[PDB]
Amino acid sequence: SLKITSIEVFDCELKKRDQTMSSYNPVLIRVNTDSGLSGIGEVGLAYGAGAKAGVGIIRDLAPLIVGEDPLNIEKIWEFFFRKTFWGMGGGNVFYAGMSAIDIALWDIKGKYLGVPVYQLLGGKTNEKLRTYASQLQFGWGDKNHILVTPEEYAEAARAALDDGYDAIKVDPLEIDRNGDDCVFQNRNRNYSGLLLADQLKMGEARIAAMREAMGDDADIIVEIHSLLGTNSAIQFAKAIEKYRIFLYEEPIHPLNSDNMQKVSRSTTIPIATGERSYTRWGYRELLEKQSIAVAQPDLCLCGGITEGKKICDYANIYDTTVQVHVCGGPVSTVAALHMETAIPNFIIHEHHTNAMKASIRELCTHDYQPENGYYVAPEQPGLGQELNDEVVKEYLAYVIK
Template sequence: MKITKIDVMLVDVKSTDNPGWSPIVCRVYTDEGIYGDGEAAMAYGVGATGAFGIIQDLSKKVIGMNPLDNEVIWEKLYKSTFWAQNGGPVIFSGISAIDIALWDIKGKYFKMPLYQLLGGKMRNKLRCYASQLQFGWGDTKVAAASIEDYVFYAKKAVSEGYDAIKIDFFTFAPDGTRYNSETTTRLQSPKYVNMVINRLKAVREAVGSNVDIIMENHSYIDAQVAVQIGSLAKEYGILFFEEPCTPNPKMNKFVCDKLNIPIAQGERIYTRWGYAPYFENNSIQLIQPDLGNCGGITEGKKICDLAHIYDVGVQMHVCASPLSTAVALHLEAAIPNFTIHEHHVYNLHQYNKQLCVYDYQPKNGYFEVPDLPGIGNEWSDYVFKNSILVTIK
């Protein structure tokens, strides 16, 4: 079997709620009629067009190769592209998209779901949390501004069966405007510290002690502010403190040692080489690799296995299309150190749901794993009709 061509697409989701959402996806075709779909997890922030370009460049290197040789292809892309070694999100998002598509092909070829190829399911259901409630919890994106907003969305998620939620309490000001780095870095005045802690306190009181709260900060604050806020947040039983500072093993270690709160990091850490220093200095307790930018399934499994050596838990970072949701569920089901799955609020939005044939959603706070061959999801007709599409042959 050989790879014959690859479609690379920059999708226009036509969203007024989230106009910056720019999924970068691909479909890999073979001479046996089997195709596989993949995604580069750079739909948000700045850099989506970089991912769009790098997948095209990488695709030229794999045309004619056997898609079942995922390890061979991964090593070729890593060693023959110069920039992949010690590379960052753009190049590893490109490798990830192609790698995911190859695993999709492999599953279809052997008529097995992905989790079976990864060693089998260790669990039939996966606990998940309602993620990023500062953007609301419904089918439209909103700004949680008042304490009443935070309480409302937290209670709404819990009423749907979730017993874990995640919130960045320092994203929006009380007037609904978004804070910038000038506000959130360096030691904070009581005005901002009290705002964050009062929001957290209100949510904890609203949901009770049997609901886990993950406090997110998207690395917008620095290590000093993380310690300042985290020391006060401890009282409210934080499950994990996510991205409390710039992803850096030394800064992570500083925050971890000062707070004695489990630290979560990973959506901006790439490959096993990127994760190794965090494991070696015990500065991370929950890794959050994104299979759409850490190097794909081939590399993601290695990262999870390496974490297992150090008793570090795993939660895949999932802020992408329903295709990436399916991919994450397969790997999370197959590893021993799975902790919890991220169910991002964007997965409730129609502009995202329309991208795939299947829309997997949890029931009562738990996901089931797709049982179809391969990933168990694929791009919808919408993607092919509403994209800038480049075909590499």
């Protein structure tokens, strides 16, 4: 049999190699065994305020499974859920720690059994995966900058379509009229109540310009990053329904599920959420209340592959399809690709604007990128990724033995 021998934690402070990417700190792990099979995982706190907590949570959780059999993945998941105290009252950090370990264990099991992770998740259901260009308020391809003017948003939409995408996502309210970023800066605090005329006009004009540039057929997902409250989310939705919006993502935060239901009932645009929703239990009220068209769990936050699969299976009975949230290192991308290949209720894959950055790509050994708007799964045993040790040795923070 196998025993876990050590877990390495990498604090990937990208600013050390790429000062461009200073808002960014992937947290990667490697779980090693006495057989010599290792697996890699990722804690999904690469952006916002969380990376150092993410490193910490691996230090908290890793000691509990040193010496244990990695193949009992359900048992290990349940132990973390039940026997840690915080497993039964956890959130983004705790479940991110479980997720990272869980991903690595799936990687190990695939290598042990000689097959890609999608085989272990039910086989090749989807041979290729429709993909969108994500977060175009930061540009696409050539012109990468913070976009303010409607013409700039139109240009980014054209760039993405020229790159062979037939779907894009944009947050048209994140960037204020001065070019400040409302996700991370105290700007437009009124967003949580009702929009001002200028703000409604700013957001609608960006979407209008993008729809004009793209034509009618390509799809537009409107990302809101939980910036709006129930009333402004509905207000803005009604202003943009005329542009044929595919999905309306995180119109408000997920903490009040009844408010999510009210948003969904009050616009014709289908609602997506999930990146800030963790475990089956974090989807129960969203699904039961018929509030969402699309679930977007992050496999590096929601409980990993074991739990992600369960969220997908559950979503299916409410006609809710799945786009895994992906915004971190290469490990998140491969976990998503295996999940999406296997699940019958896949809808679309998210290709983040920064997924081609050198400092992200160099963390791992393989590069999986879309071609002409489509992704395919890795075919090697396990996830099909390893860490690039030449780079990650500089990011090694802790070894749990």
